Structure 1
Amino acid sequence: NRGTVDFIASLENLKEGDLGILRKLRGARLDEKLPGFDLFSALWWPLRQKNQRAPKREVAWLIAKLFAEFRFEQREGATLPILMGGICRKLEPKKELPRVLARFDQLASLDIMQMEEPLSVIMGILRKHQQVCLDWVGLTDVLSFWEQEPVKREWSDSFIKAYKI
């Protein structure tokens, strides 16, 4: 998973100009606004040459855009279901919890190509409670193998384990 680590580290090493370039391209394709294409090609291509493994292009593009919009310090041990469960536990158990849980459970139904806005609402709820960390490497690894059933099983189980305690 060293390629994912290098990808995330290169994402943190980015300056503010190309970060704004990526911020302006939210919800867009890869075939327009050439500076975004050039920046993404510079970010992703050296991973394949040295490292045999590399994250998928759609997953990498989604992660880069989400990082540009929702800049978070990468820290090991801060997976998205755990933080979501910790947020969900300190909620009203009658009305707000079913709504936020429905917004979370919408995520484990789509493909990579349609997860942008359902992930952006989650990151907005995270930013509302002033988070300072997110495991981008673990999220990228989970998003890579999103079609395997034990991956979704562990995602839901980690959410429930963090919610219950």
Structure 2
Amino acid sequence: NRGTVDFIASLENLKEGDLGILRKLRGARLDEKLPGFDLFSALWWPLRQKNQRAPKREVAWLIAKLFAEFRFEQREGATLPILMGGICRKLEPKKELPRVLARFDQLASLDIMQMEEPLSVIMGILRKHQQVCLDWVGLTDVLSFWEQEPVKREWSDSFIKAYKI
């Protein structure tokens, strides 16, 4: 989809200081700090004007902050419930595995403006296991499409089929 791949490319082309000012902006909105809003305008407004399929404001802001925090490379076929879910096969099935499973289970019951913290702990579990690649494009178009039930359905049984291999 156009408008999202170039968003991921521009996020990946961001330099270290820009990622730092995005990192400090994590945990709050963008109305209290200027350079966060200037950066969101610079990375959104021309790409919003150029394409009709630009992502929604808050999901784009969430993915920008999470990419600044974690910095995983973009790679096709590396979405969240595959990588976590293959991670969920190497744990103790009676105690630890239900706890990490509930950590991933929490994600299905948030709106878009508190969603970054359970995602942050999930991506921290990913970082603790040396995971370098994530389908950032896949994550953001399934996150912008969060209003429907079938998308969460295919999310979930993708986790299931990653678990049963």
Alignment TM-score, normalising by the size of structure 1:
0.98
Cα displacement (A) at 1:66: 0.1
The alpha-carbon deviation at position 50 of structure 1 amounts to 1.4
Distance in 1 (alpha carbons) for counterparts of 2:60 and 2:112: 10
Q: Which runs of 5+ in 1 are unaligned?
A: none
User: Where does residue 57 of structure 1 map in the other structure?
Assistant: 57
Cα separation, 2, equivalents of 1:159 and 1:114: 23
Secondary structure of the structure 2 residue equivalent to 1:113: coil
User: Matched residues in 2 for 1:34 and 1:100: separation?
Assistant: 37
* C-alpha distance in structure 2 between counterparts of 1:52 and 1:92, whole Å: 47
Q: What per-residue deviation string (whole Å, max 9, x for no partner) do you get for residues 87-113 of structure 1?
A: 001111110000000010000111111
Task: Structure 2 unaligned segments of length 5 or more: list them.
Answer: none
Counterpart of 1:119 in structure 2 is 119
Question: For residues 109-131 of structure 1, what are the alpha-carbon distances to aligned partners after superposition, in whole Å with 9 as ceiling and x for unaligned?
Answer: 11111111100000000000001
Residue by residue, what CA displacement relative to the aligned partner does 1:71-94 show, whole Å, maximum 9, x if unpaired?
001111100010110000111111
State how far apart, in whole Å, the 2-side matches of 1:135 and 1:98 are: 25
Superposition deviation, residue 48 in structure 1: 1.8
Q: Secondary structure at the match of 2:91?
A: coil
Cα offsets for 1:122-141 (capped at 9, x unmatched): 00000000011000000000
In the other structure, the counterpart of 1:106 is 106
Which shifted more, 36-45 or 46-55? 46-55
Q: Distance in 1 between matches of 2:164 and 2:114?
A: 29
C-alpha displacement at 1:156, in angstroms? Answer: 0.2
**Residues 43-72 of structure 1, C-alpha deviations (whole Å, 9 max, x = no match):** 011112111111000000000000000000
Tell me the distance in 2 between the aligned counterparts of 1:114 and 1:39.
21
The 2-side partners of 1:114 and 1:135 are apart by 21
C-alpha offsets along residues 20-46 of structure 1, whole Å, 9 cap, x if unaligned? 000111111110110111011000111
Find the counterpart in structure 2 of residue 158 from structure 1.
158
2:113 counterpart SS class:
helix
TM-score by length of 2: 0.98
Runs of 4+ in 1 over 4 A off after TM superposition: none
- For 1:128, the equivalent position in structure 2 comes to 128
Size of the aligned set, in residue pairs, is 165
Q: Distance in 2 between matches of 1:12 and 1:66?
A: 12
